[PDB]
Every structure is written in C-alpha cells, then in structure tokens.
C-alpha cells in the first residue's frame, strides 16, 4: 500500500536529481549514498519556533506574510487529520 521508505528516498533523490546515461546513473547512486549516510549519522549522535519566524518577517518589514503565515498555522490545527513533524521539518528548512 504505502511505499517502502526505500522507494520514498529513491523518489526524493530523483525528485531533485539534476538534469540511458552513466554519469547520471552513478550520480543517483551517490545521491542515495549521501541521503542514507546522512540520515544514519544524524540519528546516532514545536510551534514556538514557527511563531518566532513570523515575528522575524515582521521585523523583516514583511508584515503581509507574517499575517498570512500565522493565519495558516492557526487554520491548520483548527481542524480535528493525519503533522507536527512536517512543520518541524518545514521550520527546519526555513
């Protein structure tokens, strides 16, 4: 049903693979190798954050967006369905 997280990583590598082939194929293999080894190192040795970001756009001058953004994180959790972790990631990649 849901895809093996192998194939998810495969899809993500391909999802940002740059441009048959050989250099393209040896690249993918190394893209995977950076992906897996990076997961593997990091794992061996919430909304607070996202409000503080909306604050910085406000101090960035970006009023309009800081308005929109806190509307969206209020509107997300005003719904009773399957995401603290995605935000965590999004706020991670800010």
């Amino acid at each position: 049903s849901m895809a093996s997280i192998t194939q998810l990583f495969d899809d993500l590598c391909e999802a940002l693979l740059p441009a048959r082939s050989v250099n393209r194929k040896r690249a993918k293999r190394s893209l995977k190798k950076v992906a897996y080894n990076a997961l593997f190192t990091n794992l061996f040795q919430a909304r607070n954050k996202i409000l503080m970001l909306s604050f910085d756009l406000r101090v960035g001058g970006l009023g309009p967006k800081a308005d929109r953004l806190e509307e969206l994180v209020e509107e997300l959790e005003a719904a009773p369905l399957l995401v603290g972790s995605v935000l965590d990631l999004l706020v991670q990649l800010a």
Binding site: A3, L12, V34, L93
Partner: protein
C-alpha cells in the same frame, strides 16, 4: 461512504495550504518533493533527520552540478 472521498479532499486542500507555508518560509520544496517528505515523515522519519538529509543532498546536487 461520502467520508471516504471527503477525506481525499481535506488532505488535498490541506496539502495545498501547508505547501503555501513551505513556500512562505522559503524551504525550497516543490509540491512533488514536499509530498515525498510528508510520506517519509508519516512513516517515522524524524523531521530533523529528514531536513538534514534534504540539506546535504541539495549541497551535493549543487556541487555535483559542476
């Protein structure tokens, strides 16, 4: 019944909105990739680790581009 499909609309609409916030926060993720990461997350992938693995491969991508 109707809630089986009404689920698919909520996750679509709601996938659209936090995509939009991903765009706001300037994460780099496009729709396709975003979804991948939603899946990974829901399987148990730690968000810290998952961002970190996104970071480093952007890095190598950029660098491998030369």
């Amino acid at each position: 019944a109707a809630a089986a499909a009404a689920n698919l609309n909520a996750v679509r609409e709601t996938m659209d909105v936090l995509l939009e916030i991903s765009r706001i926060l300037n994460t780099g993720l496009d729709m396709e990739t975003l979804s991948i990461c939603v899946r990974l997350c829901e399987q148990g992938i730690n968000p810290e680790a998952l961002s970190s693995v996104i970071k480093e491969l952007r890095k190598a991508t950029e660098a491998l581009k030369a």
